[PDB]
Design a protein around this ligand. Structure first.
Ligand SMILES: C[C@H]1O[C@H](O[C@H]2[C@H](O)[C@@H](O)[C@@H](O[C@H]3[C@H](O)[C@@H](O)[C@@H](O)O[C@@H]3CO)O[C@@H]2CO)[C@H](O)[C@@H](O)[C@@H]1N[C@H]1C=C(CO)[C@@H](O)[C@H](O)[C@H]1O
Ligand SMILES: C[C@H]1O[C@H](O[C@H]2[C@H](O)[C@@H](O)[C@@H](O[C@H]3[C@H](O)[C@@H](O)[C@@H](O)O[C@@H]3CO)O[C@@H]2CO)[C@H](O)[C@@H](O)[C@@H]1N[C@H]1C=C(CO)[C@@H](O)[C@H](O)[C@H]1O
Ligand SMILES: Nc1ncnc2c1ncn2[C@@H]1O[C@H](COP(=O)(O)OP(=O)(O)OP(=O)(O)O)[C@@H](O)[C@H]1O
Ligand SMILES: Nc1ncnc2c1ncn2[C@@H]1O[C@H](COP(=O)(O)OP(=O)(O)OP(=O)(O)O)[C@@H](O)[C@H]1O
Ligand SMILES: [Ca+2]
Ligand SMILES: [Ca+2]
Ligand SMILES: [Ca+2]
Ligand SMILES: [Ca+2]
Ligand SMILES: [Ca+2]
Lengths: 298, 306
């Protein structure tokens, strides 16, 4: 097999509960509509996003030998998407997501796996070799997969999410990947952290994702960021800003591996992000090629 | 119609309906902290306590319990089956396309519990009546959870000459949904929590129903038992067990019922059956979780005699 983008880590299972309002009314118990179990989470989005754009994605991760684990397996099977895994006693990552009619989406994340577990590198090595780009989730063990992906001469990316710019946990990913993505939300002195990443890391550029006010792209030796205005899709207004980041990354990677322009890949990402934001956290939806091209041309 | 375990031997207590699967989430506080997302310790999936607690309590006391209910042909369904098999408790079920009943339960360190319940099954649904009828023939007593279709199981059990019980839980004494159960069972259990005018509701229950007595559970202040003749309630103080202080009182009611039923079916004395019920209740409260541990015979007798 051969993949455009290998995703390492992050697959999990979401249990979605529709509630009247957030904050929750003050009661001992309340009846809710059917609670759906779906595949969701941070890494799963990039793989599905890549696949939706007609590129070949794949996944390497640690799941559980449990019902949710088999659920993930079968779900990946239904798509054209190869998945390589080992199982650990602690079981599959899972979440409960509280969503409302509004779109405000509370998420209770269960990381599940022991922090200090490190799998046999056989989990990622064949994938890395059969893959063109490797996107690496900040699962604690995946830091060694990142190591290998660089060593194998594949281009790498990673998504730091809410990182404050000081914490040591993220630094290996921040300093070890070619294309680094991070949320602006927890970023005290953006330009400082960015400079630090260039000082101490191998990053070719850094994409900051600020949601509402779009995204900023920092490159080496540019004192100023390319500013990317957020994108509005007629008929598909913002309803849920949860899950945008993975759709942004997926589209960025697909465009960039195709065309090679950082500026244009950033706008592709912005479209992808906007598309996810216009989707109801009840159904899974990723921009396809036809729509991306249409919107990008505008 | 699918029977697991010994769907052959006589049962002391058949439980009808109520089983589901709980996803238990341990959270920082109720009301919830203000965030898009926070992380929690591992989320455990277990069988709930609603029908399951009573069956377990009865079995724990060395009596033969059994379950008849509607589950889904899904993973939560298979968990329920395997869980009953591991516990040694026969279960008979049918499956429905809407799937197994499930909940997400939000609990904190205090004990404050919030349940988000997904019943799945259609309100007006009624399973194959063979589901409870076959149980009724092989069972001595029938305890009926307030599933909507279970009202018809209750009728059939009375008609068949079985003694019946039910747990109305938090009933206001006004809602019409519960009345078939309130007026239709021999032994009625109800929570005080939502009871506006207890003595009124009790009087109503004896006037319009076949109940021999009404047990009102009140947690902190114990339990009150009303009989037909007696104009006054029998009051049963809560019970303190040395070495087992109170840690979690959720699910206690199920244990009260299981122990009450086991004693009463043997001796027939209501006052003592109530005290057995209190011991069962006290035991459950000293365990963390809703259906974690049930008093056995040796311990009931020991504590009951003291
Ligand atoms: C995917 C997840 O990434 C981020 O979480 C990471 C933390 O920032 C790190 O501190 C580290 O957490 C570990 C801690 O060192 C320690 O407390 C230990 O108990 O283990 C923790 C994890 O086991 O690593 C975390 C990644 O595992 C970020 O903060 C978090 O918000 C991210 N998850 C959300 C993302 C999305 C969308 O991408 C939602 O769909 C998910 O359900 C959220 O959980
Ligand atoms: C066991 C359960 O009993 C009670 O819930 C019942 C309601 O009180 C009934 O009114 C009826 O609800 C139906 C309504 O008529 C209507 O809204 C319709 O749309 O369908 C509703 C669902 O059938 O039936 C309910 C049971 O199905 C009681 O109020 C409730 O507290 C009980 N459930 C929780 C109780 C405990 C403790 O026993 C929690 O720990 C459990 O996890 C909850 O499931
Ligand atoms: N309300 C919005 N309007 C327009 N675009 C949005 C909106 N929210 C998000 N986006 C798009 O999604 C991208 C990232 O959004 P955001 O920064 O909110 O993700 P995030 O919260 O970092 O994701 P994660 O859950 O991975 O942390 C932005 O670049 C933006 O283009
Ligand atoms: N804190 C406690 N101390 C002593 N006994 C208790 C305590 N809580 C409950 N019990 C015993 O359990 C019985 C039921 O209490 P309670 O009314 O809280 O049940 P419930 O919450 O209605 O049950 P469920 O949660 O199944 O609906 C009481 O009659 C009491 O004897
Ligand atoms: Ca990711
Ligand atoms: Ca992000
Ligand atoms: Ca329950
Ligand atoms: Ca019950
Ligand atoms: Ca009760």
């Amino acid at each position: 097999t051969q993949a455009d983008v290998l995703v390492v880590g992050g697959v999990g299972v979401d249990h979605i509960v529709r509630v009247k309002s957030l904050p929750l009314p003050v009661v001992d118990s309340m009846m809710v509509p059917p609670i759906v179990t779906v595949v969701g989470h941070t890494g799963n989005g990039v793989a599905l996003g890549v696949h939706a754009l007609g590129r070949a994605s794949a996944m390497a991760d640690v799941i559980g030998d449990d019902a949710e684990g088999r659920l993930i397996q079968d779900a990946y099977s239904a798509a054209g998407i190869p998945i390589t895994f080992v199982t650990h006693i602690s079981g599959t990552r899972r979440s409960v997501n509280l969503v409302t009619e509004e779109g405000q989406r509370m998420s209770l994340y269960d990381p599940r796996h022991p922090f200090e577990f490190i799998p046999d590198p056989s989990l990622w090595r064949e994938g890395i070799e059969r893959s063109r780009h490797v996107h690496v989730s900040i699962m604690n063990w995946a830091r060694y997969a990142l190591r290998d992906a660089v060593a194998a001469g594949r281009s790498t990316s990673t998504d730091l999410h809410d990182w404050d710019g000081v914490a040591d946990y993220h630094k290996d990913f921040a300093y070890g990947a070619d294309y680094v993505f991070v949320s602006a939300a927890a970023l005290r002195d953006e330009s400082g952290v960015v400079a630090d990443v260039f000082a101490r890391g191998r990053a070719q550029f850094v994409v900051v994702m600020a949601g509402s006010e779009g995204a900023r792209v920092w490159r080496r030796s540019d004192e100023l960021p390319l500013r990317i205005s957020p994108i509005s899709i007629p008929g598909r207004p913002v309803v849920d800003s949860n899950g945008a980041g993975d759709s942004f990354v997926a589209a960025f990677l697909c465009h960039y591996l195709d065309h090679g322009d950082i500026f244009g890949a950033a706008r592709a990402g912005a479209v992808g992000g906007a598309w996810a934001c216009g989707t109801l956290g009840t159904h899974t939806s990723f921009v396809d090629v036809e729509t991306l091209e249409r919107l990008l041309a505008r």
